[PDB]
Amino acid sequence: VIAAHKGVNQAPVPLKMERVGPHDVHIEMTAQITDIEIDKGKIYKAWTFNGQAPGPLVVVNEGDTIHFTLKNMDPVVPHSMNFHAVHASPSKDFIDVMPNKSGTFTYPANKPGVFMYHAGTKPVLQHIANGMHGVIIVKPKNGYPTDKEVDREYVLIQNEWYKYNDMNDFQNGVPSYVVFSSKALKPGDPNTNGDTFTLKEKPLLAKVGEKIRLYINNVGPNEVSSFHVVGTVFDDVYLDGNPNNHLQGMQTVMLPASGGAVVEFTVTRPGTYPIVTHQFNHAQKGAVAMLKVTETGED
Amino acid sequence: VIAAHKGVNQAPVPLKMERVGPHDVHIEMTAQITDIEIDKGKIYKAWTFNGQAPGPLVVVNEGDTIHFTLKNMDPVVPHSMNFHAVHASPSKDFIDVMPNKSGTFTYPANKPGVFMYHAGTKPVLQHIANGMHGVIIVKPKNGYPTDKEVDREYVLIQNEWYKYNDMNDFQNGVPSYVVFSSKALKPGDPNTNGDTFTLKEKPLLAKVGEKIRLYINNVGPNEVSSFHVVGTVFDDVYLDGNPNNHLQGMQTVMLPASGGAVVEFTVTRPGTYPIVTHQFNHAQKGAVAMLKVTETGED
Amino acid sequence: VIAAHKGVNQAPVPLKMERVGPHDVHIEMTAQITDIEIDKGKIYKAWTFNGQAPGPLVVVNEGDTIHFTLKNMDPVVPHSMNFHAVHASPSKDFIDVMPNKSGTFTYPANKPGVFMYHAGTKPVLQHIANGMHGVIIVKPKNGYPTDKEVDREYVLIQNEWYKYNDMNDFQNGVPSYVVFSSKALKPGDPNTNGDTFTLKEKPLLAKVGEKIRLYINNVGPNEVSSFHVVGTVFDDVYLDGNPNNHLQGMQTVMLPASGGAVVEFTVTRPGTYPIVTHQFNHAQKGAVAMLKVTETGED
Ligand SMILES: O=N[O-]
Ligand SMILES: O=N[O-]
Ligand SMILES: O=N[O-]
Ligand SMILES: O=N[O-]
Ligand SMILES: O=N[O-]
Ligand SMILES: O=N[O-]
Ligand SMILES: [Cu+2]
Ligand SMILES: [Cu+2]
Ligand SMILES: [Cu+2]
Ligand SMILES: [Cu+2]
Ligand SMILES: [Cu+2]
Ligand SMILES: [Cu+2]
Ligand SMILES: [Cu+2]
Ligand SMILES: [Cu+2]
Ligand SMILES: [Cu+2]
Ligand SMILES: [Cu+2]
Ligand SMILES: [Cu+2]
Ligand SMILES: [Cu+2]
Ligand SMILES: [Cu+2]
Ligand SMILES: [Cu+2]
Ligand SMILES: [Cu+2]
């Protein structure tokens, strides 16, 4: 634990977003050091955006230019932001912001989909593994062909956790935990961090007969994901959330590290449905969420 | 070795299946403890369906409802069944059957493809790793567009084996063996277990010039598979065996854990053709099968 | 270090190719033992084709029959060649050539794409891991639908390096290095070996606004690749380089071991753009290349 991080636990700060034109959006995040309970009794003093790991959800429209400000609250470590959604010059636009400073960077989100974002400061592995990852969704101008069939939707993110700030482990060791989190799209949706237990104890909710859409991304840092919902089959899958990349009837979706998808499936009966990576060593180490399906859709 | 499993070696029992209506099929399996030779001189006292690991092949038609009975012969461990093919309530329909009891569960197979099945009892990793995995094929109502080109077909399954019933190894260790097995579709086809040697010593057979279809699934538990046939290219691939997910001219097919495919390729010359996962550490640890191609198609 | 390899460092020999008919091409390679600097201060006495690892690039046209000669310069180890592009009998056409001998083998390249080649001598893992891997590109007769949009193109290959000639490490250990190399398509293109530094210090070059095509293959031996270019999104992707396998708007391309692709992306701003596998443990261990984009396209 970096001497200047000892005892530091910066309270989470809300994401700030506001539209400033028909095709322009302001976003303001922080980089901050925040204690997160990743397993019961296990605190990780994470490197975060806004005190969440993964960070807060960003949603924009295809064709929006993002005017992004990062306020670095870390007392000693520089941080930066890399959005996979955007076309940008990495050496000009994804550059470091020093402690106690801010930086603003502008770039377009030209492509629909479910994109990873993460800090881009060398060593990138260190910043991602310590918690500086997240998702930005870019909504397609023309929608998805199955939009009218979807009854309910959520966002799920997979990540790993390693021994604390240990570059040897990050490079060469198996993950200690692999976890899901959910980030809110609409008021009332849960908003959680990557931990082994919250989405088991407080399942996502749905109603019998519904078609559910999940926007998913496996942020890694290191593992691929074999994404599967127990008790159903994916009716439709759009790789990276691009409407053109359309598969049907998949049992399990292969996600690379940073890989995204939009997946849709029908829940036909009441009960609790596990959501896993089917790499079962990772599932055993935390990567199981639950979907509770009731006759009403409320608990 | 669980005290009540010491010395236990339950003889394999045939799968029971019978059609009971134009869209309804009965299946009866066992859960049982059976010694399997996974490498020469290496016995694994596997947790199995029907004394095979992977378990027996199930084939049904798209739109069939399955009335599935599990007879648990294990003297002490509960077991259950999860079919990836079906729409079901996991907490009602994939529940545990206690030792010396049976349970019956009914659910539809609405989607064509090559699906994993496995025990769903917590910890799922333990039940899969110990051998409780298999494949169910759901035949598409409308076939595949290349059906008329296929001359011969087989089923191949990839799995791993770890240190015996060792949850630490299952979670954190590399596999000791990675293996292929073949499960019979028609009388005379081989029916083998996941071992390092049988499909090398007794290759699958084909005839010069034939187009071969393989129904494949990588059941894991933990690894992905880079499926490749030496000396050919896949003419056509259907991801998860759904006819819509149609690729052409692939050298190697990426399978997630639990991932399936229908793959088709032409063998143009006499000889022996290795079949591998191209993750060559896994191939070296057992995952090489052989296809012997002769002028007649018989040995 | 095999006693007969001690002190051996065979100078690289150029690939020999010549067209001998409208649909027939001669290729002559060597198998040879050559010291390669894989990281600064770290020499690997590689098993190679032609003194390069990965080996030299081969480019042919769809429908060409290849008349391939391997001249084995290794004083003691037999070697062979397996081209993923071709239809061949592995047990007749991919056979070993003994030390100080040559062998010639003929087979057709019927399928367009970006194919791995490698030695096929048992244990195959040993020959691949020690450096005997490479790429053959088969150009599609009808092109790719986006050909007219591409301004500049390069070839990139990903491989791993392990502890020297250590079969235990090859089977059971994490890679010590994961690396990119580039192989020349046109005069003036760089031609490099798999190392941790050359494509950082001497980036690939491009011009602002260009659409870039990369022909890529992950030769392994053991890992999958999460291929990503920072600061852009792939406009179009053709899996295995087959024009039919067409995805759009992908952030990251999942490559199995031996998996290939043609990927295309636009660079909109001047700067330096990292090229990674997004499995960041591998990126940290060497697998980052750089693309320098200038107003002119020259350094
Ligand atoms: O039903 N999924 O194992
Ligand atoms: O089907 N999830 O084990
Ligand atoms: O020819 N497959 O290495
Ligand atoms: O092409 N199998 O090494
Ligand atoms: O912008 N790629 O992290
Ligand atoms: O987006 N490369 O970290
Ligand atoms: Cu407008
Ligand atoms: Cu602004
Ligand atoms: Cu950071
Ligand atoms: Cu990234
Ligand atoms: Cu509905
Ligand atoms: Cu009917
Ligand atoms: Cu019945
Ligand atoms: Cu079991
Ligand atoms: Cu499952
Ligand atoms: Cu035929
Ligand atoms: Cu001609
Ligand atoms: Cu010739
Ligand atoms: Cu060799
Ligand atoms: Cu190969
Ligand atoms: Cu252009």
Numbering used by the authors:
A (entry chain A), B (entry chain A), C (entry chain A): 17 to 315
How do the authors describe this structure?
Copper-containing nitrite reductases (CuNIRs) catalyze transformation of nitrite to nitric oxide, which has impacts on geochemical, agricultural, and medical health fields. CuNIRs typically have an ∼110 kDa homotrimeric structure, like a Reuleaux triangle. Each protomer contains one type 1 copper (T1Cu) and one type 2 copper (T2Cu) site. The Cys residue forms a peptide-bond bridge (Cys-His bridge) together with one of the His ligands at the T2Cu site to transfer the electron to the catalytic T2Cu site, which is coordinated by three His residues and an axial water molecule.
To further obtain insights into the catalytic intermediates of CuNIR, we performed atomic resolution X-ray crystallography with D98N mutant series of GtNIR in which the Asn residue imitates the protonated state of AspCAT. The structures of D98N without NO2- and C135A/D98N with NO2- were determined at 1.05 and 1.12 Å resolution, respectively. The NO2- complex structure shows multiple conformations of NO2-, indicating that AspCAT is necessary to keep the substrate at the proper position with the configuration suitable for NO2- reduction. In contrast, our atomic resolution data unambiguously revealed three binding modes of NO2-. One is a κ1-O complex that is present only when Asn98 assumes a conformation similar to the gatekeeper (GK) mode. In the GK-like conformation, the side chain of Asn98 is flipped away from the catalytic site and cannot form a hydrogen bond with the substrate. A GK-like conformation of D98N is not observed in the D98N structure without NO2-, which indicates that repulsion between NO2- and Asn98 results in the GK-like conformation. The third binding mode is the κ1-N mode that is also observed in the C135A/D98N structure.
